[PDB]
Amino acid sequence: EISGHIVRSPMVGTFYRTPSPDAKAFIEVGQKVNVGDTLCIVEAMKMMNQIEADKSGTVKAILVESGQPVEFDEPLVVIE
Ligand SMILES: *C(=O)CCCC[C@@H]1SC[C@@H]2NC(=O)N[C@@H]21
């Protein structure tokens, strides 16, 4: 059985769950995202790699661990 969809970081940077401290937190666990919705930023050299969920579904968890540097092909967020 498939485990949904997993999003692996395309490059290296810095994962996160809550951008601008004065925000509403990005797509965290138990969250709902639809093809066309935001996801999160990578923060690679100040590029704001703000990804946008394009597979719809409900986030299951994160393996990259926000606040931690990102690496090529890193499960940023796994959707259910
Ligand atoms: C880049 O100019 C310096 C670091 C910027 C950090 C960014 S702002 C939105 C995210 N939230 C946070 O705490 N850090 C990320």
Side-chain angles (χ1 to χ4, degrees):
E1 70 243 71
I2 44 135
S3 12
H5 4 300
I6 311 205
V7 194
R8 247 183 273 86
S9 110
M11 246 121 74
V12 168
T14 307
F15 194 52
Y16 280 141
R17 327 226 242 187
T18 39
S20 339
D22 314 321
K24 240 199 139 196
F26 258 135
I27 317 311
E28 247 252 276
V29 185
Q31 184 69 9
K32 42 279 264 274
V33 266
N34 43 307
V35 173
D37 248 61
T38 346
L39 193 102
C40 253
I41 293 130
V42 177
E43 191 195 60
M45 100 213 81
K46 211 47 47 152
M47 160 267 297
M48 283 39 223
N49 211 354
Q50 171 240 286
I51 315 301
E52 306 157 84
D54 56 314
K55 273 288 157 118
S56 120
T58 285
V59 189
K60 232 310 295 265
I62 300 180
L63 280 64
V64 167
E65 278 193 292
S66 123
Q68 174 223 255
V70 197
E71 36 256 322
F72 164 74
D73 279 34
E74 227 299 0
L76 281 151
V77 207
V78 312
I79 325 106
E80 191 226 69

Short mmCIF file of all heavy atoms in Angstrom, two decimals, residues 16 18-21 43 46 48, ligand 1:
data_model
loop_
_atom_site.label_atom_id
_atom_site.label_comp_id
_atom_site.label_asym_id
_atom_site.label_seq_id
_atom_site.Cartn_x
_atom_site.Cartn_y
_atom_site.Cartn_z
N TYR A 16 11.36 25.24 7.50
CA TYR A 16 10.65 26.03 8.50
C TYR A 16 9.17 25.67 8.53
O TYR A 16 8.64 25.09 7.58
CB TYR A 16 10.81 27.52 8.20
CG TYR A 16 12.13 28.10 8.65
CD1 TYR A 16 12.81 29.03 7.87
CD2 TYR A 16 12.70 27.71 9.86
CE1 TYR A 16 14.02 29.57 8.29
CE2 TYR A 16 13.91 28.24 10.28
CZ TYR A 16 14.57 29.16 9.49
OH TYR A 16 15.77 29.69 9.90
N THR A 18 6.94 28.05 10.48
CA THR A 18 6.29 29.33 10.72
C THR A 18 7.18 30.48 10.27
O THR A 18 8.00 30.98 11.04
CB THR A 18 5.96 29.48 12.20
OG1 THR A 18 7.00 28.97 13.01
CG2 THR A 18 4.68 28.78 12.60
N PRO A 19 7.00 30.93 9.02
CA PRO A 19 7.78 32.05 8.47
C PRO A 19 7.64 33.30 9.33
O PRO A 19 7.66 33.21 10.56
CB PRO A 19 7.18 32.26 7.08
CG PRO A 19 6.52 30.97 6.75
CD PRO A 19 6.04 30.40 8.05
N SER A 20 7.51 34.45 8.69
CA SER A 20 7.36 35.72 9.41
C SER A 20 6.67 35.50 10.75
O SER A 20 5.46 35.28 10.81
CB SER A 20 6.57 36.72 8.57
OG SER A 20 6.61 36.37 7.19
N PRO A 21 7.45 35.55 11.85
CA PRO A 21 6.94 35.35 13.20
C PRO A 21 5.50 35.83 13.37
O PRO A 21 4.74 35.27 14.16
CB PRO A 21 7.91 36.19 14.02
CG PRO A 21 9.22 36.03 13.31
CD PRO A 21 8.90 35.80 11.85
N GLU A 43 14.46 28.89 2.09
CA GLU A 43 15.40 29.89 2.58
C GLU A 43 16.82 29.58 2.12
O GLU A 43 17.73 29.44 2.93
CB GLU A 43 15.35 29.96 4.11
CG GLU A 43 16.09 31.15 4.70
CD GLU A 43 16.34 31.01 6.18
OE1 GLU A 43 17.02 30.04 6.58
OE2 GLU A 43 15.86 31.86 6.95
N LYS A 46 18.51 33.34 0.66
CA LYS A 46 17.51 34.40 0.66
C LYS A 46 16.73 34.41 -0.65
O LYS A 46 16.68 35.43 -1.34
CB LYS A 46 18.17 35.75 0.89
CG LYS A 46 17.28 36.75 1.62
CD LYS A 46 16.63 36.12 2.84
CE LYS A 46 17.64 35.35 3.68
NZ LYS A 46 17.26 35.32 5.09
N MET A 48 13.57 32.64 -0.64
CA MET A 48 12.20 32.39 -0.21
C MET A 48 11.56 31.28 -1.04
O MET A 48 10.53 31.47 -1.67
CB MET A 48 11.36 33.67 -0.33
CG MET A 48 11.60 34.66 0.80
SD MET A 48 13.34 34.75 1.28
CE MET A 48 13.20 34.78 3.06
C1 LIG B 1 17.34 36.37 5.90
O1 LIG B 1 17.20 37.51 5.46
C2 LIG B 1 17.61 36.19 7.38
C3 LIG B 1 16.83 35.02 7.97
C4 LIG B 1 15.35 35.12 7.67
C5 LIG B 1 14.55 34.08 8.44
C6 LIG B 1 13.19 33.77 7.81
S1 LIG B 1 11.91 35.07 8.00
C7 LIG B 1 10.56 33.84 7.80
C8 LIG B 1 11.05 32.58 8.51
N1 LIG B 1 10.81 32.62 9.95
C9 LIG B 1 11.92 32.58 10.69
O2 LIG B 1 11.98 32.60 11.92
N2 LIG B 1 12.95 32.52 9.85
C10 LIG B 1 12.57 32.51 8.44
#
